[PDB]
Short mmCIF file of N, CA and C (backbone and C1' of nucleotides) and ligand atoms in Angstrom, two decimals:
data_model
loop_
_atom_site.label_atom_id
_atom_site.label_comp_id
_atom_site.label_asym_id
_atom_site.label_seq_id
_atom_site.Cartn_x
_atom_site.Cartn_y
_atom_site.Cartn_z
N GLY A 1039 -18.25 12.29 -4.11
CA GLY A 1039 -17.90 11.97 -3.95
C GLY A 1039 -17.58 11.65 -3.63
N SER A 1040 -17.15 11.11 -3.16
CA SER A 1040 -16.82 10.77 -2.81
C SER A 1040 -16.40 10.35 -2.50
N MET A 1041 -16.56 9.41 -2.56
CA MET A 1041 -16.20 8.93 -2.28
C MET A 1041 -16.28 8.16 -2.81
N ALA A 1042 -16.55 8.38 -3.82
CA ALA A 1042 -16.65 7.70 -4.42
C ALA A 1042 -15.64 7.51 -4.71
N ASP A 1043 -15.20 8.15 -5.06
CA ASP A 1043 -14.23 8.05 -5.37
C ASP A 1043 -13.31 8.40 -4.70
N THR A 1044 -13.16 8.09 -3.76
CA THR A 1044 -12.31 8.37 -3.06
C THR A 1044 -11.11 7.70 -2.94
N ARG A 1045 -10.67 7.02 -3.51
CA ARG A 1045 -9.53 6.34 -3.48
C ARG A 1045 -9.04 5.94 -4.77
N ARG A 1046 -8.05 5.12 -4.80
CA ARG A 1046 -7.52 4.66 -5.98
C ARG A 1046 -6.80 5.66 -6.77
N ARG A 1047 -5.72 5.32 -7.20
CA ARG A 1047 -4.95 6.10 -8.03
C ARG A 1047 -4.13 7.19 -7.68
N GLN A 1048 -3.14 6.99 -7.02
CA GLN A 1048 -2.27 8.00 -6.72
C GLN A 1048 -0.88 7.65 -7.00
N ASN A 1049 -0.23 6.75 -6.62
CA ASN A 1049 1.12 6.38 -6.84
C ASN A 1049 1.34 4.89 -6.88
N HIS A 1050 0.34 4.11 -6.76
CA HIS A 1050 0.50 2.70 -6.79
C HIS A 1050 1.25 2.22 -5.56
N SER A 1051 0.91 1.09 -5.05
CA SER A 1051 1.56 0.54 -3.87
C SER A 1051 2.37 -0.70 -4.19
N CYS A 1052 3.35 -1.00 -3.35
CA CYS A 1052 4.19 -2.17 -3.56
C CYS A 1052 3.44 -3.46 -3.30
N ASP A 1053 4.00 -4.56 -3.79
CA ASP A 1053 3.37 -5.85 -3.59
C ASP A 1053 2.88 -6.03 -2.15
N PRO A 1054 3.76 -5.79 -1.19
CA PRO A 1054 3.44 -5.94 0.23
C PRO A 1054 2.45 -4.90 0.71
N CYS A 1055 2.44 -3.78 0.04
CA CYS A 1055 1.51 -2.73 0.38
C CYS A 1055 0.09 -3.15 0.06
N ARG A 1056 -0.12 -3.60 -1.15
CA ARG A 1056 -1.44 -4.03 -1.55
C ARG A 1056 -1.92 -5.16 -0.65
N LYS A 1057 -0.99 -5.96 -0.19
CA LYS A 1057 -1.32 -7.08 0.67
C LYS A 1057 -1.61 -6.64 2.11
N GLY A 1058 -1.00 -5.55 2.53
CA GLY A 1058 -1.21 -5.05 3.87
C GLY A 1058 -2.16 -3.88 3.86
N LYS A 1059 -2.65 -3.56 2.69
CA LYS A 1059 -3.55 -2.47 2.52
C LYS A 1059 -2.90 -1.17 2.94
N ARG A 1060 -1.89 -0.74 2.21
CA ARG A 1060 -1.25 0.49 2.58
C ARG A 1060 -0.74 1.27 1.38
N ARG A 1061 -0.94 2.56 1.44
CA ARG A 1061 -0.49 3.47 0.42
C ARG A 1061 0.97 3.62 0.51
N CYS A 1062 1.62 4.16 -0.50
CA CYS A 1062 3.01 4.30 -0.40
C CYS A 1062 3.71 5.27 -1.29
N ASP A 1063 5.01 5.36 -1.07
CA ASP A 1063 5.84 6.24 -1.81
C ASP A 1063 6.20 5.62 -3.13
N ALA A 1064 6.72 4.42 -3.08
CA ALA A 1064 7.09 3.71 -4.27
C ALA A 1064 6.05 3.98 -5.35
N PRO A 1065 6.35 4.88 -6.26
CA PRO A 1065 5.45 5.30 -7.33
C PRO A 1065 5.65 4.58 -8.62
N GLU A 1066 5.15 4.95 -9.63
CA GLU A 1066 5.29 4.35 -10.91
C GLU A 1066 6.70 4.43 -11.34
N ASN A 1067 7.52 5.07 -10.56
CA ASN A 1067 8.89 5.19 -10.86
C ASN A 1067 9.75 4.63 -9.76
N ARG A 1068 9.16 3.78 -8.98
CA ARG A 1068 9.87 3.14 -7.90
C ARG A 1068 11.07 2.43 -8.49
N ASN A 1069 10.86 1.84 -9.63
CA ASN A 1069 11.93 1.16 -10.32
C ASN A 1069 13.02 2.16 -10.63
N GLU A 1070 12.62 3.23 -11.29
CA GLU A 1070 13.54 4.28 -11.61
C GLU A 1070 14.07 4.89 -10.32
N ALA A 1071 13.39 4.60 -9.22
CA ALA A 1071 13.81 5.10 -7.94
C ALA A 1071 15.05 4.34 -7.52
N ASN A 1072 14.96 3.04 -7.61
CA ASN A 1072 16.08 2.21 -7.30
C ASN A 1072 17.21 2.59 -8.24
N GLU A 1073 16.82 3.04 -9.42
CA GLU A 1073 17.78 3.48 -10.40
C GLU A 1073 18.47 4.72 -9.88
N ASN A 1074 17.69 5.58 -9.25
CA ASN A 1074 18.22 6.78 -8.67
C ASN A 1074 18.34 6.56 -7.17
N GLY A 1075 18.35 5.31 -6.82
CA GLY A 1075 18.45 4.88 -5.46
C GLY A 1075 17.18 5.11 -4.65
N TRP A 1076 16.44 4.03 -4.48
CA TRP A 1076 15.21 4.05 -3.72
C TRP A 1076 15.47 3.39 -2.38
N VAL A 1077 14.74 2.38 -2.02
CA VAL A 1077 14.94 1.68 -0.77
C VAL A 1077 13.69 0.93 -0.35
N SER A 1078 12.85 1.54 0.42
CA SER A 1078 11.63 0.92 0.87
C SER A 1078 10.62 1.97 1.24
N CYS A 1079 9.44 1.83 0.75
CA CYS A 1079 8.40 2.78 1.04
C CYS A 1079 8.09 2.75 2.52
N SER A 1080 7.04 3.39 2.92
CA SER A 1080 6.70 3.41 4.33
C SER A 1080 6.32 2.03 4.84
N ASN A 1081 5.73 1.27 3.96
CA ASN A 1081 5.28 -0.06 4.29
C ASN A 1081 6.43 -1.02 4.41
N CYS A 1082 6.94 -1.46 3.29
CA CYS A 1082 8.03 -2.38 3.32
C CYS A 1082 9.02 -1.92 4.36
N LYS A 1083 9.05 -0.64 4.58
CA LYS A 1083 9.94 -0.09 5.56
C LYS A 1083 9.58 -0.55 6.97
N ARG A 1084 8.37 -0.28 7.41
CA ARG A 1084 7.97 -0.68 8.76
C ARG A 1084 8.03 -2.19 8.91
N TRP A 1085 7.74 -2.88 7.85
CA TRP A 1085 7.74 -4.34 7.86
C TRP A 1085 8.89 -4.92 7.07
N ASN A 1086 9.94 -4.14 6.92
CA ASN A 1086 11.12 -4.59 6.20
C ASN A 1086 10.72 -5.63 5.16
N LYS A 1087 9.65 -5.33 4.46
CA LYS A 1087 9.12 -6.24 3.47
C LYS A 1087 9.99 -6.30 2.22
N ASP A 1088 9.42 -6.01 1.07
CA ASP A 1088 10.17 -6.08 -0.16
C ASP A 1088 9.66 -5.09 -1.20
N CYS A 1089 9.94 -3.83 -0.98
CA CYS A 1089 9.53 -2.80 -1.90
C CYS A 1089 9.79 -3.25 -3.32
N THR A 1090 8.79 -3.67 -4.01
CA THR A 1090 9.01 -4.11 -5.36
C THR A 1090 7.85 -3.83 -6.30
N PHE A 1091 8.23 -3.42 -7.51
CA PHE A 1091 7.31 -3.12 -8.59
C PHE A 1091 7.82 -3.83 -9.85
N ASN A 1092 8.59 -4.87 -9.63
CA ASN A 1092 9.20 -5.62 -10.73
C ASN A 1092 8.37 -6.82 -11.07
N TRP A 1093 8.51 -7.82 -10.26
CA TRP A 1093 7.72 -8.98 -10.43
C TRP A 1093 6.34 -8.50 -10.71
N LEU A 1094 6.09 -7.31 -10.19
CA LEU A 1094 4.83 -6.67 -10.37
C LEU A 1094 4.69 -6.22 -11.79
N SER A 1095 5.66 -5.49 -12.22
CA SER A 1095 5.63 -5.02 -13.57
C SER A 1095 5.31 -6.20 -14.48
N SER A 1096 5.55 -7.38 -14.01
CA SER A 1096 5.28 -8.58 -14.77
C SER A 1096 4.06 -9.30 -14.23
N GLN A 1097 3.68 -9.05 -13.03
CA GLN A 1097 2.53 -9.71 -12.45
C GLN A 1097 1.26 -9.07 -12.90
N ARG A 1098 1.23 -7.79 -12.99
CA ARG A 1098 0.06 -7.08 -13.39
C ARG A 1098 -0.12 -7.15 -14.83
N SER A 1099 0.62 -6.58 -15.57
CA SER A 1099 0.52 -6.58 -16.95
C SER A 1099 1.12 -6.94 -17.76
N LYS A 1100 2.13 -7.27 -17.39
CA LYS A 1100 2.77 -7.63 -18.10
C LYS A 1100 2.45 -8.48 -18.43
N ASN A 1101 2.98 -9.09 -18.84
CA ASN A 1101 2.75 -9.92 -19.19
C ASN A 1101 3.00 -10.53 -19.72
N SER A 1102 3.06 -11.24 -19.93
CA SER A 1102 3.29 -11.87 -20.44
C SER A 1102 3.23 -12.35 -20.59
N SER A 1103 3.47 -12.88 -21.09
CA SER A 1103 3.43 -13.37 -21.27
C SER A 1103 3.64 -13.74 -21.25
P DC B 1173 14.29 2.60 15.77
"O5'" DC B 1173 13.06 1.69 15.66
"C5'" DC B 1173 13.23 0.33 15.47
"C4'" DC B 1173 11.93 -0.31 15.14
"C3'" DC B 1173 11.44 -0.05 13.73
"O3'" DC B 1173 11.76 -1.14 12.90
"C1'" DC B 1173 9.69 0.10 15.35
P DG B 1174 11.14 -1.24 11.44
"O5'" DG B 1174 9.76 -1.97 11.65
"C5'" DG B 1174 9.69 -3.38 11.66
"C4'" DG B 1174 8.66 -3.88 12.62
"C3'" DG B 1174 7.49 -4.51 12.01
"O3'" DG B 1174 7.20 -5.77 12.46
"C1'" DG B 1174 6.83 -3.00 13.54
P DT B 1175 6.35 -6.83 11.84
"O5'" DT B 1175 4.94 -6.45 11.96
"C5'" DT B 1175 4.12 -6.86 13.02
"C4'" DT B 1175 2.72 -6.45 12.77
"C3'" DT B 1175 2.41 -6.19 11.34
"O3'" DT B 1175 1.95 -7.37 10.71
"C1'" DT B 1175 1.40 -4.56 12.80
P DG B 1176 1.17 -7.28 9.34
"O5'" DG B 1176 -0.32 -7.11 9.76
"C5'" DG B 1176 -0.87 -7.80 10.88
"C4'" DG B 1176 -2.25 -7.35 11.14
"C3'" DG B 1176 -3.13 -7.35 9.94
"O3'" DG B 1176 -4.38 -7.80 10.30
"C1'" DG B 1176 -2.82 -5.12 10.67
P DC B 1177 -5.52 -7.99 9.28
"O5'" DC B 1177 -6.43 -6.78 9.48
"C5'" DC B 1177 -6.91 -6.38 10.75
"C4'" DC B 1177 -7.81 -5.25 10.61
"C3'" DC B 1177 -8.86 -5.45 9.56
"O3'" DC B 1177 -10.06 -5.02 10.01
"C1'" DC B 1177 -7.63 -3.55 9.07
P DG B 1178 -11.37 -5.55 9.40
"O5'" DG B 1178 -12.16 -4.52 8.76
"C5'" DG B 1178 -12.82 -3.86 9.41
"C4'" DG B 1178 -13.45 -2.85 8.55
"C3'" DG B 1178 -14.09 -3.32 7.33
"O3'" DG B 1178 -15.23 -2.73 7.11
"C1'" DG B 1178 -12.44 -1.87 6.71
P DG B 1179 -15.94 -2.78 5.74
"O5'" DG B 1179 -15.53 -1.57 4.99
"C5'" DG B 1179 -15.42 -0.38 5.61
"C4'" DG B 1179 -15.28 0.68 4.62
"C3'" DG B 1179 -16.02 0.43 3.34
"O3'" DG B 1179 -16.57 1.63 2.86
"C1'" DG B 1179 -13.75 0.65 2.91
P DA B 1180 -17.63 1.59 1.72
"O5'" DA B 1180 -16.91 2.11 0.48
"C5'" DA B 1180 -16.62 3.45 0.29
"C4'" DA B 1180 -16.38 3.71 -1.12
"C3'" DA B 1180 -17.32 2.97 -2.03
"O3'" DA B 1180 -17.95 3.85 -2.94
"C1'" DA B 1180 -15.02 2.43 -2.50
P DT B 1181 -19.10 3.36 -3.86
"O5'" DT B 1181 -18.39 2.81 -5.10
"C5'" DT B 1181 -17.80 3.62 -6.06
"C4'" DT B 1181 -16.95 2.92 -6.93
"C3'" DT B 1181 -17.56 1.94 -7.65
"O3'" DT B 1181 -17.59 2.26 -8.67
"C1'" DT B 1181 -15.58 1.09 -7.02
P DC B 1182 -18.02 1.64 -9.83
"O5'" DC B 1182 -17.73 0.97 -10.63
"C5'" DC B 1182 -17.86 0.84 -11.17
"C4'" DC B 1182 -17.03 0.10 -11.89
"C3'" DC B 1182 -17.06 -1.32 -12.11
"O3'" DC B 1182 -17.66 -1.48 -13.09
"C1'" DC B 1182 -15.11 -1.03 -11.43
P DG C 1182 -8.34 -10.17 -6.92
"O5'" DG C 1182 -7.58 -9.13 -7.76
"C5'" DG C 1182 -6.46 -9.37 -8.49
"C4'" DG C 1182 -5.59 -8.31 -8.75
"C3'" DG C 1182 -4.81 -7.92 -7.71
"O3'" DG C 1182 -3.52 -7.52 -8.07
"C1'" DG C 1182 -6.48 -6.46 -8.10
P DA C 1183 -2.63 -6.65 -7.36
"O5'" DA C 1183 -3.22 -5.24 -7.53
"C5'" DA C 1183 -3.70 -4.80 -8.81
"C4'" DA C 1183 -3.95 -3.32 -8.80
"C3'" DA C 1183 -3.15 -2.56 -7.76
"O3'" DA C 1183 -2.55 -1.41 -8.31
"C1'" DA C 1183 -5.48 -2.25 -7.40
P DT C 1184 -1.49 -0.57 -7.48
"O5'" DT C 1184 -2.35 0.53 -6.75
"C5'" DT C 1184 -2.73 1.74 -7.41
"C4'" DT C 1184 -3.38 2.66 -6.43
"C3'" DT C 1184 -2.51 3.00 -5.22
"O3'" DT C 1184 -2.43 4.41 -5.04
"C1'" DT C 1184 -4.64 2.23 -4.54
P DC C 1185 -1.85 5.00 -3.68
"O5'" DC C 1185 -3.13 5.18 -2.80
"C5'" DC C 1185 -4.28 5.87 -3.30
"C4'" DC C 1185 -5.14 6.35 -2.17
"C3'" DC C 1185 -4.37 7.07 -1.07
"O3'" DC C 1185 -5.21 8.03 -0.45
"C1'" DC C 1185 -5.33 5.16 -0.18
P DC C 1186 -4.56 9.20 0.43
"O5'" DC C 1186 -4.43 8.59 1.87
"C5'" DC C 1186 -5.48 8.73 2.82
"C4'" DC C 1186 -5.12 8.02 4.09
"C3'" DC C 1186 -3.65 7.78 4.28
"O3'" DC C 1186 -2.98 8.73 4.90
"C1'" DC C 1186 -5.01 5.96 4.94
P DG C 1187 -1.89 8.64 6.01
"O5'" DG C 1187 -2.74 8.66 7.25
"C5'" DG C 1187 -3.89 9.33 7.35
"C4'" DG C 1187 -4.71 8.91 8.51
"C3'" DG C 1187 -3.99 8.92 9.79
"O3'" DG C 1187 -4.82 9.35 10.83
"C1'" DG C 1187 -4.65 6.76 9.28
P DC C 1188 -4.42 9.67 12.12
"O5'" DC C 1188 -4.63 8.59 13.09
"C5'" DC C 1188 -5.73 7.80 13.14
"C4'" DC C 1188 -5.44 6.63 13.86
"C3'" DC C 1188 -4.67 6.84 15.04
"O3'" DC C 1188 -5.27 6.27 16.11
"C1'" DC C 1188 -3.74 5.14 13.75
P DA C 1189 -5.90 7.09 17.31
"O5'" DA C 1189 -5.48 6.25 18.57
"C5'" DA C 1189 -5.96 4.93 18.73
"C4'" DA C 1189 -4.97 4.11 19.49
"C3'" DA C 1189 -4.07 4.91 20.38
"O3'" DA C 1189 -4.20 4.49 21.70
"C1'" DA C 1189 -2.80 3.46 18.97
P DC C 1190 -2.93 4.38 22.64
"O5'" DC C 1190 -2.26 3.04 22.21
"C5'" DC C 1190 -3.03 1.91 21.89
"C4'" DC C 1190 -2.26 0.68 22.17
"C3'" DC C 1190 -1.24 0.83 23.27
"O3'" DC C 1190 -1.33 -0.25 24.18
"C1'" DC C 1190 -0.16 0.31 21.20
P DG C 1191 -0.54 -0.19 25.55
"O5'" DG C 1191 0.85 -0.85 25.19
"C5'" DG C 1191 1.18 -2.17 25.59
"C4'" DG C 1191 2.46 -2.60 24.94
"C3'" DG C 1191 3.73 -2.13 25.60
"O3'" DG C 1191 4.29 -3.18 26.36
"C1'" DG C 1191 3.79 -1.87 23.23
ZN1 ZN D 2635 4.66 0.35 -0.59
ZN1 ZN D 2636 7.56 -0.73 -0.50
#
DNA sequence: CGTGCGGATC
DNA sequence: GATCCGCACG
């Protein structure tokens, strides 16, 4: 494996994370995090980006439609 | 205290 | 497209 597998699938990364190629804290519950008070993962944090899984929640699958 | 990059596999 | 992952510098 490797490495195969080696990657993918652990907690999902924020919009800016995927764009900067970085893993993160903001998990599948990042939204619920903001609900329980989140902030910014390590990425958006260093780059004061925009920790978000919303537009995402709609960009990925959502869909919508 | 930000800054980005190459990779693995579909 | 997505997720992981560090790192070396100023
Ligand atoms: Zn992130
Ligand atoms: Zn973030």
